Design a protein around this ligand. Structure first.
Ligand code: HEM
Length: 291
C-alpha cells in the first residue's frame, strides 16, 4: 500500500505559512472556548487522532488520506469532542480550498503546539485525499483503562518506542478530559494551554488517589486538582517508562526536542516522500512575525 506525497500544485512555503497564520490568528480570536482554554489542545488531539489510525503492518490509516472527513472515521466513538476542532478548521479550508484535508489537519496540530509556546515541529505538505472506502474502522486508538504493557504494545503498531511513547503521551499537558466526552474529568496540570513538561513533574511530585468518577470510571486524583488516566499513571509503574519520565521532568529542552521528533514521525507515518520533494517547513509564529 504505497502513499506517495504530492505537493499541491504550484504552492510553496509562503502558501503554507499563509494557512498557518490564518489558523494562528483564529486561535487567538476564539479564546473563550472550553472555559477560555482555547482550541489549541483540541487541535493537537485531532492531529494525533487522525494519525493514530495508522497500521504499520499494512500501511492503513495515518494522516495521508484525510478520511476523518468521512462519517465513519468522523463518528468513531473515541473521537468524541473532536468535532469542535473539525468545525474550527472548516472556515479555513473554505478560505484555502486548495489545501488537502490531511495537510490541513496535521498543520492544525503543528500550529497549536508552536503557538502555545511548544517546540518547532518541522512539517511536510503533500498529503492527498482518498476515497471514503479508504476510511478506516473504529477501533485503532488506545483505551485509557489499561496498563503499561497495553501502552507499550499498542504503540508498537505505530513504530513508536518507549522513549517516543513517553514523549508523545506528555502532550505538553494540554487541555483536559471531559466526562461528557470520555467518561473522564479534569486536567493534567495548571497551565492547560501552554506547552510544558509539567506532566512529568506532576506525575512524580503529586499525591495521587485512585478514585471513581461520575462516569463510574476509576482515575488518579491529586489534591491540587489534577488527574491522570490509568494509562498515564502506568508510566511511573513501569521501570523503563519511569526512567524517561524522570529524564523529562529534569530536562525541559530534551523533552521539547524529543517530542518534536516523535510528533513529526507520527504525522508522517505511512507517507512516502520523493527525493525531489521539498525539505520540511519550519513556520515562524505570529509572535516571531509581529502579527
Ligand atoms: C495511550 C494514549 C492516550 C490515551 C488513552 C488518550 C486518552 C485521552 C482521553 C481520555 C482524553 C480526554 C478527551 C475528552 O474527554 O475530551 C484525551 C485528551 C487529549 N489527548 Fe489523548 N490519549 C492518549 C495519547 C495522546 C497523545 C499521543 C496525544 C497527542 C500528542 C494526546 C493529546 C491529547 C490532548 C491534547 C487532549 C486534550 C483535548 C482537549 O482538551 O480538548 N493524546 N486523551
Amino acid at each position: 500500500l504505497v502513499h506517495v506525497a504530492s505537493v499541491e500544485k504550484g504552492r510553496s512555503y509562503e502558501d503554507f505559512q499563509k494557512v498557518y497564520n490564518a489558523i494562528a490568528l483564529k486561535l487567538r480570536e476564539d479564546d473563550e472556548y472550553d472555559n477560555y482554554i482555547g482550541y489549541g489542545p483540541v487541535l493537537v488531539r485531532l492531529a494525533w487522532h487522525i494519525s493514530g489510525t495508522w497500521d504499520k503492518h499494512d500501511n492503513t490509516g495515518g494522516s495521508y488520506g484525510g478520511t476523518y472527513r468521512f462519517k465513519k472515521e468522523f463518528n468513531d466513538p473515541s473521537n468524541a469532542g473532536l468535532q469542535n476542532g473539525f468545525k474550527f478548521l472548516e472556515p479555513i479550508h473554505k478560505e484555502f480550498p486548495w489545501i488537502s484535508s490531511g495537510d490541513l489537519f496535521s498543520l492544525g496540530g503543528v500550529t497549536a503546539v508552536q503557538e502555545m509556546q511548544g517546540p518547532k515541529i518541522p512539517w511536510r505538505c503533500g498529503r492527498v485525499d482518498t476515497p471514503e472506502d479508504t476510511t478506516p474502522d473504529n477501533g485503532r486508538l488506545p483505551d485509557a483503562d489499561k496498563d503499561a504493557g497495553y501502552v507499550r504494545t499498542f504503540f508498537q503498531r505505530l513504530n513508536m518506542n518507549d522513549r517516543e511513547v513517553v514523549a508523545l503521551m506528555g502532550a505538553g499537558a494540554l487541555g483536559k478530559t471531559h466526562l461528557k466526552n470520555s467518561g473522564y474529568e479534569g486536567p493534567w496540570g495548571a497551565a492547560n494551554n501552554v506547552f510544558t513538561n509539567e506532566f512529568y513533574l506532576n506525575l512524580l511530585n503529586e499525591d495521587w488517589k485512585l478514585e471513581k468518577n461520575d462516569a463510574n470510571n476509576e482515575q488518579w486524583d491529586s489534591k491540587s486538582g489534577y488527574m491522570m488516566l490509568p494509562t498515564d499513571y502506568s508510566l511511573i509503574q513501569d521501570p523503563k517508562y519511569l526512567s524517561i519520565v524522570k529524564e523529562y521532568a529534569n530536562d525541559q529542552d530534551k523533552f521539547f526536542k524529543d517530542f518534536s521528533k516523535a510528533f513529526e514521525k507520527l504525522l508522517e507515518n505511512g507517507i512516502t516522500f520523493p527525493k525531489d520533494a521539498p525539505s520540511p517547513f519550519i513556520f515562524k509564529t505570529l509572535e516571531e512575525q509581529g502579527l
